[PDB]
Structure 1
């Protein structure tokens, strides 16, 4: 019998997801009469000769082997309500002529004949033979059909390895993969979905002047770098090897996510801080309605209570900015306020303590760098310059004080000495950096694990390049802890010089290089080579949400020439170059949490222990909490991979996975293509490991290093971003100023008031979860596969994360674990998987989304 297949299309109109139309001011969303489509009839526009869908048979082919096409059919009618219809979603009825000749639909083509694009959410088919409903999850913007050569195609729910693809769909699956790759030529346009690679030749503006030029990162041995998404803009006129600047940076269309709520448009907020808030605030300082300099610590604390008095000239141009109404507290006229950072909510002065300084290396914004000291004195990895065939100038006489009464040899034996080494990355650039307004040191800090389980800083080494040349080693000075008099003020400054090194390393390497930059080539390789239908595509896809968008924004506004990072952080104009130098030492398999802990000497392998490793510092909150989430991720990945691959041979035989990984190594991270540590993709265990590392990187690692930025460093005093003065010398006038007024001396050493305001405004956005964040584990978008085994496995994953959330909260109430809270009384909640919106100090998103 000839029968009609009943379809329901769910879509979302442009107006409901677009920044320009959704900006009134934003407060409630997910709500409304869950904007049921029908009401307010722009919906009738979709109902004529506007939108056509054409079914493609999965089980029946034409003469040349491609699935049989049905008749192009138009949207018939509006569905007013459905039990699962969401906020902003509109539903349409469409009935397809099909018969028992053309078999089971497995894909469809769609054509939009309207002027305006819409976001296609889903197709659902209610069918004909002994067959359940067929679901299609689309989540894609559909532009006008005249813009494309072949029609937009979408496949059903069914997950298929290349060998498992229904014969009539084989050519459709390969053709879309081809269309996603492009041909490597052309300027990319907004409506396109073309994924390809380019180097970082994107950040400078050499047409504006030679001092605005920035070196090309990647594709050479001096500055290797991961690739980023190809945009295809015309080169600069002055330099052929650099790409010209634009106010719009292309990314493949479905990588840019819209939002139902105005305040969830965070990249928009960030861009507005660069383009609108930064030049306008800079005008208050280039005048005098704001004094240029903080004069006291009380003046810093006033940012959070009464705020900073600005004229209403600037205030009335900054307060009605679309997304920024949430993050900028405004009393009325004479104040820009900032929310109190968690670090000072219980105690204003606890950050100054040695124990908080030390604790923040284990549970702070950059909890990833500390190493156990294996030999003494600490050595440098630098080349022919002679302090690197020499050592640190910290001596054994320096480390014998008050606490445990051990010798240095004993304390190394018993694994009680630890190092935070910031000597090598900055050293080669120090002479250049100190020729600007910045004055910095290369630092080392040695820490002792006390009997009470907490860490204590024992000595700080400050090093400068050269009395008489670089071949002459390091000029080093050593500073010891002190709690009274001028010597305590010196020690606080020594601590600030370390933290200034740490903040810059954190921003550029721990955060930017190790999450953002390193992940982007994996997104490109995945889309280029794995069909949407591939199991591993589905495993990885939630972990890529909005990453290319925030990275494109970073290229424009954050990491560009004269952008926020160069103006705010210690390394200045060398910031991104130096991160390429650090990338020379990046190894993919050491990003796995257990490998990292082992590599830094913070754990030893031990099968007697809960995660197979024994920690050397038991109360190391980042690492003990991280290991629960790492193990949950790796278990999920293993269960999932082993649903699909029957043997290692079926993995070796998979052409999509093999081409993905070959292009990842040879092109995406192509400056490291000959490194021997890359997984070969010859074994299911190597696939598990690679996939776990990408998901850990995108989710927990980025969250751990990102979401504590405002809570710890919203007080500039605790995490200063640059230094401007060398240490006061014993008989100068600066030492007397330190004696008479140490707060003023502290303040004129660290980040000035202007750059403090920029820093705070940026890290307040960076530390916020949007309302519509999708978190690790439980959360996905929809009906993403019809494989009930995968659904069950994913549910087990969600359940384990909820169990881990309870265990983690319980550790926060344990009084024996002092590193979890500190004198600052800030329970470590950074690795708690779930969160509400805002500046919470918690929540692990699936992806790098901000």
Structure 2
């Protein structure tokens, strides 16, 4: 049939190459608000938007993440580019090589040939990419006619990664049988350098410092009157803080800070959770009190209650050096808090509030803002690889016996339900950096001076905020241009109606639009960076932090031992999974905030509007201001106890893609 014949030749590779070239042409259109476009442009963009809703499709019944608004599938165009692919394949092949090299010869035979070939094929692909990038340079006028070999390279790396997958499954099918004090926790690294946290994780001031400069800087809050369920009294406080101090004066001088994990819900099973693959696991919803001394030199831990009900969880107080009989009970209570922390951090702060929020903004943007809408142009780079990585999360990390089931004590269907619930309850406006710092009363550096996430995050937040304002003003001259924009209004409708983004509301003016975009951009870029890139240095070593414990919380502050603490350490399989997935997820830096060039070949500018790209213009100013931020952070880091480098703009990707 004449009507069918084109289908034969029209494969996926051809279609990716077709979309890539279409991409670059549609790139030429000067962007416009729909009300300022001409009749022809209005008709074409309504047609494209209809076609966009074919390809970008909402579901709330995606595998393993029921309830969460997701893409039904990742469009061909949204598959990662060669550059991301090579990078990520590179890390996983390194980790495979490291692992096989750590096995006895007998057992290595399973994998050693497959691994050698994966490593050699990656090397052949990298060399291809290099030579392709050399011919473009030698003849840049012919550059556009090399894109097809870049798409061909893309097909080759995808196939590499499918083979990489088959090996990882075979290794991890066998790991429980392959795995062999804290000796086992160092052995899992193989040749990987152990993080610095492995040498100081027992230090009490280091433990407090997690609250302000660790992977979860969001939960800590000021407390003015302690709640009934945390019955710490003045004698206990004064025992830690000195007789010249008191709860009452500490409260009043804004020196008390509470860490309360009540919101974990089923992520903190009420008791033992026995699993075949990992044995008996526990996790917790503790409450910990921290305080500043009068000089506010630094936060100190004061007391830890290992669950919500004091009638069933005793109060653990910071011991003195001399108090050997309290030493181990206290190390157990800290471990409890860190078990809560991995759960809170990874499920809520990382997965629910970055990844899964950006999912919804991605889908709404592609479905309702035309490709030539200025806000599409602005936002699209900040979603690159987001749909792909999150489908990765759902499929690969969240099923039975997957990484999350292995690494987090809860039953996997409780984990999935609690993660998704936190996403659905997450309020877009309350979740804004300035709003979070106000609501928790941690916004004033004279009360809480050392808080690197706050002070470094405000630099980045405010830099993005000026950029958004500068950019909106190019296109929207008044509030009426905002309310007359039918695309922006449809986007709002979908963010609420399909995206289920709590707290989202009509946008009725420019200042509010700026705040909205600032949130969307910051969430995709800096917030993600801040909570994802700690994983390799802070969360790869299981005795410092793990989302499951093999023993219950300590039953008494007194009389515990080293043996009793060691009981809490997880099985070896958990530690093996931990080091590998956390190295991986924090080792791919793809794209950079403010660059706004394509991150794949031909690496073209994002913005063609000469008003945006003008010398001294909005984009240049944002790029200049990020470099000023870098320099200020680097200066701050000279005076800090440890550098906090996650919010250096040079380390912040534009998008959430790992």
TM-score grouping bracket, smaller chain normalisation: 0.7 to 0.9
Partners of 1:833 and 1:115 lie apart in 2 by: 36
Match of 1:600 in 2: 440
Match of 1:695 in 2: 521
Whether 2:17 is the aligned partner of 1:173: answer no
Partners of 1:619 and 1:597 lie apart in 2 by: 14
Alignment map for 1:283-362 (pairs within 5 Å): 283-286=174-177, 290-291=179-180, 296-304=181-189, 307=190, 337-344=191-198, 348=199, 350-362=200-212
SS in 2 for 1:756: helix
Whether 2:596 is the aligned partner of 1:788: answer no
Alignment map for 1:801-816 (pairs within 5 Å): 801-814=626-639
Unaligned ranges ≥5, structure 1: 1-111, 122-137, 143-151, 183-193, 204-215, 219-224, 231-249, 308-336, 379-389, 466-472, 605-613, 822-826, 835-842
Match of 1:762 in 2: 581
Q: Is the alpha carbon distance of 1:282 and 1:393 closer, same or farther for their aligned partners in structure 2, counting shifts above 3 Å?
A: farther
More displaced stretch, 363-372 vs 447-456: 447-456
Q: Is the alpha carbon distance of 1:281 and 1:114 closer, same or farther for their aligned partners in structure 2, counting shifts above 3 Å?
A: closer
How far off its partner does 1:659 sit? 0.8
Tell me the matched-pair count: 566
Whether 2:137 is the aligned partner of 1:252: answer no
How far off its partner does 1:264 sit? 1.4
Does the CA-based 8 Å contact 1:278-1:758 persist in structure 2?
A: no
Q: Is the alpha carbon distance of 1:217 and 1:704 closer, same or farther for their aligned partners in structure 2, counting shifts above 3 Å?
A: same
How far off its partner does 1:282 sit? 4.8
**CA shift digits 1:769-827 (9 cap, x unpaired):** 24xx210013422233332221121111011001110110011112xx33xx1xxxxx1
Alignment map for 1:361-760 (pairs within 5 Å): 361-376=211-226, 378=227, 390-403=228-241, 405-426=244-265, 430-431=269-270, 434=273, 437-450=280-293, 451-463=295-307, 475-482=312-319, 483=321, 484-573=323-412, 574-583=414-423, 585-603=425-443, 616-669=447-500, 672=502, 677-727=503-553, 729=555, 739=561, 742=562, 744-760=563-579
Partners of 1:582 and 1:518 lie apart in 2 by: 11
Q: Which of the residues 76, 82, 88 maps onto 1:265?
A: 88
How far off its partner does 1:546 sit? 0.2
**CA shift digits 1:552-603 (9 cap, x unpaired):** 1111111233321121113342112112333454210122111010111102
How far off its partner does 1:748 sit? 2.5
The structure with the larger Rg is 1
Unaligned ranges ≥5, structure 2: 1-8, 93-160, 599-603
How far off its partner does 1:524 sit? 0.8
Partners of 1:577 and 1:115 lie apart in 2 by: 35
TM-score when scaled to structure 1? 0.63
Greater fraction strand: 1
**CA shift digits 1:371-409 (9 cap, x unpaired):** 010222x3xxxxxxxxxxx52233333211254522211
Q: Is the alpha carbon distance of 1:262 and 1:597 closer, same or farther for their aligned partners in structure 2, counting shifts above 3 Å?
A: closer
SS in 2 for 1:552: helix
Alignment map for 1:194-205 (pairs within 5 Å): 194-203=55-64
SS in 1 for 2:238: coil
How far off its partner does 1:201 sit? 4.3
Partners of 1:261 and 1:665 lie apart in 2 by: 31
Q: Which of the residues 229, 232, 235 maps onto 2:71?
A: 229
How far off its partner does 1:448 sit? 0.6
Partners of 1:197 and 1:530 lie apart in 2 by: 16
Match of 2:34 in 1: 162
How far off its partner does 1:700 sit? 0.5
Greater fraction helix: 2
Does the CA-based 8 Å contact 2:240-2:317 persist in structure 1?
A: no
**CA shift digits 1:130-149 (9 cap, x unpaired):** xxxxxxxx74579xxxxxxx
Q: Is the alpha carbon distance of 1:559 and 1:585 closer, same or farther for their aligned partners in structure 2, counting shifts above 3 Å?
A: same
Q: Is the alpha carbon distance of 1:117 and 1:554 closer, same or farther for their aligned partners in structure 2, counting shifts above 3 Å?
A: same
Match of 1:210 in 2: none
Partners of 1:273 and 1:710 lie apart in 2 by: 21
SS in 1 for 2:300: strand
Partners of 1:114 and 1:727 lie apart in 2 by: 57
Q: Is the alpha carbon distance of 1:116 and 1:556 closer, same or farther for their aligned partners in structure 2, counting shifts above 3 Å?
A: closer
Partners of 2:271 and 2:630 lie apart in 1 by: 47
How far off its partner does 1:455 sit? 0.5
How far off its partner does 1:303 sit? 4.1
Match of 2:158 in 1: none
Partners of 1:627 and 1:271 lie apart in 2 by: 41
Partners of 1:757 and 1:429 lie apart in 2 by: 23
Match of 2:171 in 1: 280
Q: Is the alpha carbon distance of 1:267 and 1:532 closer, same or farther for their aligned partners in structure 2, counting shifts above 3 Å?
A: farther
Does the CA-based 8 Å contact 1:228-1:521 persist in structure 2?
A: yes
Partners of 1:720 and 1:562 lie apart in 2 by: 17
Match of 2:653 in 1: 845
Partners of 1:516 and 1:767 lie apart in 2 by: 14
Match of 1:833 in 2: 649
Q: Which of the residues 591, 604, 609 maps onto 1:774?
A: 591
SS in 2 for 1:399: helix
How far off its partner does 1:727 sit? 4.2
Q: Which of the residues 7, 10, 14 maps onto 1:117?
A: 14
